[PDB]
Design an enzyme around this catalytic site. Structure first.
Site, PDB file in Angstrom:
ATOM      1  N   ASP A 148      69.286  25.399  39.997  1.00 30.93           N
ATOM      2  CA  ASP A 148      69.746  25.302  39.350  1.00 30.93           C
ATOM      3  C   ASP A 148      71.909  25.822  39.730  1.00 30.93           C
ATOM      4  O   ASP A 148      72.333  26.543  39.374  1.00 30.93           O
ATOM      5  CB  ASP A 148      70.420  25.185  38.194  1.00 30.93           C
ATOM      6  CG  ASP A 148      70.843  24.463  37.391  1.00 30.93           C
ATOM      7  OD1 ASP A 148      71.794  24.259  37.614  1.00 30.93           O
ATOM      8  OD2 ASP A 148      70.458  24.497  35.686  1.00 30.93           O
ATOM      9  N   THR A 149      72.672  24.602  40.750  1.00 31.31           N
ATOM     10  CA  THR A 149      74.316  25.521  40.914  1.00 31.31           C
ATOM     11  C   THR A 149      74.384  25.914  39.761  1.00 31.31           C
ATOM     12  O   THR A 149      75.707  26.890  38.762  1.00 31.31           O
ATOM     13  CB  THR A 149      74.433  25.296  41.965  1.00 31.31           C
ATOM     14  OG1 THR A 149      75.062  23.663  41.481  1.00 31.31           O
ATOM     15  CG2 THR A 149      73.919  25.067  43.227  1.00 31.31           C
ATOM     16  N   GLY A 150      74.753  25.006  38.226  1.00 31.68           N
ATOM     17  CA  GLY A 150      75.249  25.472  37.200  1.00 31.68           C
ATOM     18  C   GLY A 150      75.032  26.103  36.111  1.00 31.68           C
ATOM     19  O   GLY A 150      75.533  25.639  35.028  1.00 31.68           O
TER      20      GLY A 150
HETATM   21  C1  LIG Z   1      65.627  15.620  30.619  1.00 36.59           C
HETATM   22  C2  LIG Z   1      66.429  16.641  31.801  1.00 36.59           C
HETATM   23  N1  LIG Z   1      68.343  15.976  31.536  1.00 36.59           N
HETATM   24  C3  LIG Z   1      68.860  17.323  32.351  1.00 36.59           C
HETATM   25  C4  LIG Z   1      68.713  16.370  33.499  1.00 36.59           C
HETATM   26  O1  LIG Z   1      70.374  15.819  34.120  1.00 36.59           O
HETATM   27  C5  LIG Z   1      69.930  15.591  33.116  1.00 36.59           C
HETATM   28  O2  LIG Z   1      72.074  15.139  33.521  1.00 36.59           O
HETATM   29  C6  LIG Z   1      72.794  15.888  33.011  1.00 36.59           C
HETATM   30  C7  LIG Z   1      73.100  16.679  31.822  1.00 36.59           C
HETATM   31  C8  LIG Z   1      71.405  17.017  32.046  1.00 36.59           C
HETATM   32  O3  LIG Z   1      71.177  18.037  32.427  1.00 36.59           O
HETATM   33  C9  LIG Z   1      71.135  19.422  32.124  1.00 36.59           C
HETATM   34  O4  LIG Z   1      71.556  19.507  30.792  1.00 36.59           O
HETATM   35  N2  LIG Z   1      71.311  20.131  33.613  1.00 36.59           N
HETATM   36  C10 LIG Z   1      70.915  22.385  32.881  1.00 36.59           C
HETATM   37  C11 LIG Z   1      69.757  22.143  33.349  1.00 36.59           C
HETATM   38  C12 LIG Z   1      68.603  21.660  32.545  1.00 36.59           C
HETATM   39  C13 LIG Z   1      68.065  20.629  33.231  1.00 36.59           C
HETATM   40  C14 LIG Z   1      66.797  19.654  32.641  1.00 36.59           C
HETATM   41  C15 LIG Z   1      66.982  20.672  30.726  1.00 36.59           C
HETATM   42  C16 LIG Z   1      67.473  20.864  30.371  1.00 36.59           C
HETATM   43  C17 LIG Z   1      69.039  21.655  31.358  1.00 36.59           C
HETATM   44  C18 LIG Z   1      71.953  22.149  33.881  1.00 36.59           C
HETATM   45  O5  LIG Z   1      71.992  22.238  35.509  1.00 36.59           O
HETATM   46  C19 LIG Z   1      72.480  24.376  33.681  1.00 36.59           C
HETATM   47  N3  LIG Z   1      73.281  23.886  32.619  1.00 36.59           N
HETATM   48  C20 LIG Z   1      74.887  24.779  32.400  1.00 36.59           C
HETATM   49  C21 LIG Z   1      75.682  23.221  32.470  1.00 36.59           C
HETATM   50  C22 LIG Z   1      74.980  21.963  30.853  1.00 36.59           C
HETATM   51  C23 LIG Z   1      76.806  23.763  32.494  1.00 36.59           C
HETATM   52  S1  LIG Z   1      72.071  25.185  31.109  1.00 36.59           S
HETATM   53  O6  LIG Z   1      70.850  25.179  31.280  1.00 36.59           O
HETATM   54  O7  LIG Z   1      72.518  24.097  30.210  1.00 36.59           O
HETATM   55  C24 LIG Z   1      72.620  27.102  31.423  1.00 36.59           C
HETATM   56  C25 LIG Z   1      71.998  27.143  32.292  1.00 36.59           C
HETATM   57  C26 LIG Z   1      71.746  28.966  32.174  1.00 36.59           C
HETATM   58  C27 LIG Z   1      72.538  29.722  31.251  1.00 36.59           C
HETATM   59  O8  LIG Z   1      72.807  30.883  31.661  1.00 36.59           O
HETATM   60  C28 LIG Z   1      73.819  31.297  31.099  1.00 36.59           C
HETATM   61  C29 LIG Z   1      73.385  28.546  30.696  1.00 36.59           C
HETATM   62  C30 LIG Z   1      73.314  27.196  30.713  1.00 36.59           C
HETATM   63  C31 LIG Z   1      70.349  16.180  31.934  1.00 36.59           C
END
Ligand SMILES: CCN[C@H]1CO[C@@H]2OCC[C@H](OC(=O)N[C@@H](Cc3ccccc3)[C@H](O)CN(CC(C)C)S(=O)(=O)c3ccc(OC)cc3)[C@@H]21
Ligand SMILES: [Cl-]
Ligand SMILES: [Cl-]
Ligand SMILES: [Cl-]
Ligand code: NA
Lengths: 99, 99
Positions: free
Chosen positions: A25-27
């Protein structure tokens, strides 16, 4: 390898002696794993994203094997819905985004 | 380009004729942008992230430029903490993860 993004970039990891599926996860700034036990010291932390914040335990200097590549760094453990490999360990395995 | 991950992979995007900063995010299935005005009808969508679910507005077939590459596709608008370019548009610009 070269991973296309038609599908979620899921890989197998080995952490704390266990095998787990995790998302590259690059984000994500940090690596966050679902509840599990890890050895050593830890301190509480809050991390936030879409939806708000969760409380996690921060373990430092943890070894993880990511798709066959060993890396060490900080790992956060808490009620995340998905195991996420964040930039702090992607850098160690030399991962890059290309287009 | 080849983008390493020692810092956030932030790029400039252009949408609705405005320039914004966004995060290339392999962990995001969908693209999510902070509140702005977009043309056309929208549809409801619930998305889940690290801290829980949020309601967003789904706009389809939106023109958006990403680091200089043209894409046209779905953009979700809502209380995201940062603009996120997800796999639905990273595939349109040819992005891959490599290590
Ligand atoms: C049901 C899945 N839907 C998700 C999957 O894609 C969908 O469409 C986009 C929005 C959401 O995706 C995510 O929330 N993706 C997450 C990673 C992630 C994946 C899956 C579940 C939860 C998180 C991100 O890749 C990483 N996130 C950061 C970004 C929102 C800025 S994060 O997981 O909250 C994060 C990680 C480490 C961290 O350290 C400081 C702080 C925050 C929806
Ligand atoms: Cl680290
Ligand atoms: Cl490097
Ligand atoms: Cl799309
Ligand atoms: Na430690």
């Amino acid at each position: 390898p070269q991973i296309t993004l038609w599908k979620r970039p899921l890989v197998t990891i080995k952490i704390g002696g266990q095998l787990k599926e995790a998302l590259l996860d690059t984000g994500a700034d940090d690596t966050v794993i679902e509840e599990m036990s890890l050895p050593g010291r830890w301190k509480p932390k809050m991390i936030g994203g879409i939806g708000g914040f969760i409380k996690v335990r921060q373990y430092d200097q943890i070894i993880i094997e990511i798709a066959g590549h060993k890396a060490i760094g900080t790992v956060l453990v808490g009620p995340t819905p998905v195991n996420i490999i964040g930039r702090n360990l992607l850098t160690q395995i030399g991962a890059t985004l290309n287009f």
